């Protein structure tokens, strides 16, 4: 099997001198044949923080990351690498890193305070922000890669368990795994788009730490995959938090497209920083254009269901309600659980976990008020439990007392008063 | 490969126009193509306990599992379920899960509080018993599932190391692993039975836990493979506590007989309760036999 | 896949009627086929101590493991081992492991106070010096074992997780598991089609994993030296969410640098043992990989970071020349940094844990650190060289004794760099505040 070279939402050339070596929130990274050498072009999406800047490429960087401080090149042949921070108060530097037969360097990562760089032998080489090595590591071969501050996201490959990933903090003291070489269960690749899969066989779009600092990866299947639950092995899950090709299904109307494509950029609290690909490659191209929004939502929605309403899609409210209270559980789930770890890092990160339980209940009292209107006590009983504010609680007695169910509020009150009991221990 | 939609104990059509959906210590879920349509019969063990029953199944469901309180049904190809409580004070509910192209329900599973939907692209989908979804986890294609109150027992399968394992609390906490897709030992299929091992390629006959809460799988080699020590990763084995075909064969006064097999519906401490098929088929017809025990 | 007998260091007989069994920092073990018997050979490097001795095999012993008290042997077929102490006082003794259909042992360990012997299934037998049986454990198959006092570093493969390794202690009731069949990201042998003619294709035939040894350092730490020619250590083998696996030494490359850079077919490393920093092994010339007879004299290769690239290299020799591989000092720094940086935490994790064992290693430990600052103010040298006060100022913090922080602050000032003093300053005052709460 051979390695490719990765980077986040690269694309290749197909049958044009250009393509872009990596792309984000920041902004991208292109590049194009300049007869034996390269011309690198680095642009970014906030004109008014950082200069678009361009530079000639004596080497061939097929390797590229992008932070908010600076940019990291490689080369997966040669071995070497270049960081350009993008303040000129800050110097460049350069390395090469040591390549064995047939070693190939297949990914690379910058953090303001990290420099990653991994191979297809499963060298884990590691660097601060000025180029100092801090310890060479040998784990399975590494395939993708991505960082955040000081901690990292790694996905590796074999013969043998295929994908796996791998989740680590290099702190000021030593390195520490949360999670080591753990399955992976992202759907492989299974033609026009032949040239993307060639030039990136695992069919990995793009990979990254949400805003929050969640490991988040889209698969050819387009499809965002978050981590939950990292923290505590025993209870880490894989979840599937956005159907995108469902997403477009609906903005076209319950149409089926061949020519309209997501290209993930980065997860920013409930929102997929993208780009709208309209052509007949998966792949963005020049000019690039400009970054679109796409709001989470829980794959919970049916084709056949959402068509029968609508005789932009338009969404029933009892369906709708459902797939809220599954994203605000989730969401409001990992933000806490971020709180309780990490505590803070925007600044408003208090005031979202609120409003989110907040739309959790609403969204939560809408199925109640359903359950009530087809005199189903038992299933309302049990949203009711579900319920996290003790104000949704009493609300749900009135929805209880309008819909003359008493022998339901009686049970309601059964659970305030339990709730009660426990604030008095 | 081929992801068949599977149930425990289920049977194939064969030459047929009828089959068992399910079948466990609780009863038998049975399917009779109709003109067009499909008669579904819920029998049970101990009459006199629940209500038999039967409707009308204008869907086709080839999807099943019973417990003690209820009936889940699944159709593998346009994702739909329903639930149905034995008894009348709970109602019935129905729902469609989301399917991408090519993706099939594989396996269900339910208990009185939790209700399971595994695909063949790796889609967990839980539920309460009423139908409130809880989590939506991407995994690895599943292909058998079974549950226990709140535990859960799935079979996977990966392209690479093919068959493993999980096993999991789906409690009001979080959904927490004790083992997470390590090794199956169990053996694959190496006639007559071929239309079996078509329905069922992985010729995993049935699973199911034990009384006292152990995963239990019985394999196309016939013999109940029991996971002893499960909570102790370190110490977890799995025991070979019955071979199906020694015990035959003593029964037989030490001949080898060809027209007997042993199909399996549970585990209840120191008996295994099954069926005792006679015929050349390995899976039972109709009528059904006697359910009979085998001490361990 | 088909489970072959494993030794550590052993050769296989080849085109020859001749191998050796095993071979360590101890001495070595060959065997000589004897018509229809075999003719074993103990033989020993410190000849002061041990005497070489010789014995008739009439069941021949495949597996053995060699320590400083006796030596172990083992048939992979019968089953049939036997302990022989180098002593007179303690009597061999010999028994027979259970086998069942096709199970074979595939490796054996011994030291002077236990006996491990796995087999193809994964059956984990131990004895005591004597042979009194343990409790009998049931893991992963085992492709390799060794061990060090009481503790045990085990291989083991499987068509599910691939390669694994685990690491335990034998206590004197039960096994207790530092480590349990963890990821072992030591690189398999790549095998062409050229190589079905290949001189050394009778070694992946004998060694299918190609793990040419293992052993447990002289201070402990878990090693293992693979066909890919590189030692890997695994630090912090006692904290198991911060377990690393390190290559910390390229023999290829070493080789490479003691040629003077040219490329060399005939070269190759034998390993025998780790001792602090550096690899006890055999240099073997020829064509085979392997020793053969007779056996070299016993060489030393000190270990090295994997941070030096051959281009770079070649190109400051011109230089050097123009005024074996000389290494610019610069260069130079930066290895002996990192090398020096991973030595320390290792050997300070082995104080901290298990102590003293030879009576010098806080000795050791006193010139490593020193040695580390050392290298490091290099460094910072050249970073104030460069003007690059922000690199130099990182560096000044990894920085350990509070003399070596005067030492960069004095260089600080020789290279007229006034903020960075100031700074580097405030390093010394905030260890200063720390200290006190």
């Known amino acids: 099997f051979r390695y490719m070279p990765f980077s986040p ?5 197909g049958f044009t001198d250009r393509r872009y070596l990596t792309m984000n929130e920041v902004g991208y990274v292109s590049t194009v044949k300049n007869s034996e050498q390269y011309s690198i072009t680095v642009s970014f999406f906030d004109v008014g923080r950082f200069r678009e800047y361009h530079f000639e490429d004596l080497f061939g960087y097929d390797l590229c990351f992008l932070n908010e401080k600076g940019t990291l090149f490689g080369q997966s042949k040669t071995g070497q690498i270049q960081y350009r921070p993008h303040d000129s108060i800050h110097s460049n530097w350069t390395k090469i ?14 953090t303001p305070v990290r420099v990653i ?5 499963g060298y884990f080489r590691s660097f601060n922000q000025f180029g100092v090595p801090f310890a060479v590591e040998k784990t399975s071969p590494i395939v993708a890669l991505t960082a955040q501050n000081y901690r990292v996201f790694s996905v590796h490959y074999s013969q043998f368990h295929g994908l796996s990933y791998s989740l680590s903090e290099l702190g000021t003291s030593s390195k520490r795994y949360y999670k080591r070489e753990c399955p992976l269960p992202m759907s492989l690749p299974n033609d026009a788009n032949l040239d993307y899969y060639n030039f990136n066989p695992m069919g990995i779009k793009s990979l990254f730490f949400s805003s929050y600092g969640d490991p988040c990866i889209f698969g050819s299947d387009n499809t965002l ?3 939950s639950k990292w923290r505590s092995p025993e209870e880490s899950k894989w979840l599937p938090i956005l159907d995108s090709n469902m997403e477009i299904w609906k903005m076209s109307g319950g149409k089926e497209t061949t020519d309209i494509h997501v290209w993930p950029l980065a997860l920013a609290y409930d929102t997929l920083n993208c780009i709208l690909v309209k052509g007949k490659h998966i792949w ?3 000019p690039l254009p400009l970054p679109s929004e796409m709001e989470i939502r829980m794959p919970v929605f049916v084709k056949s269901k959402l068509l029968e309403e609508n005789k932009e899609i338009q969404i029933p409210v009892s369906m709708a309600a459902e797939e809220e209270y599954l994203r605000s559980k989730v969401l409001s789930e990992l933000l806490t659980d971020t709180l309780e770890n990490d505590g803070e890092m925007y600044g408003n990160e208090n005031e979202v976990l609120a409003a989110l339980n907040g739309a959790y209940d609403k969204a939560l009292l809408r199925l109640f008020a359903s359950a009530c209107s087809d005199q189903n006590v038992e299933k309302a009983l049990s949203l009711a439990h579900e319920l996290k504010q003790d104000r949704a609680l009493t ?4 929805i209880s007392e309008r819909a003359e169910l008493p022998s339901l509020v009686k049970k309601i009150n059964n659970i305030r008063e339990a709730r009660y009991e426990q604030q008095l221990k």
């Open 395 to 398: 609300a749900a007695v009135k």
């Open 9 to 13: 939402a690269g694309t290749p050339f």
């Open 97 to 110: 890193i040591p390549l064995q037969a047939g070693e190939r360097i297949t990914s690379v990562a910058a």
């Open 117 to 121: 760089v991994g191979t297809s032998l």
């Open 225 to 227: 995959l978050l981590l």
């Open 284 to 286: 963005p191209e020049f």
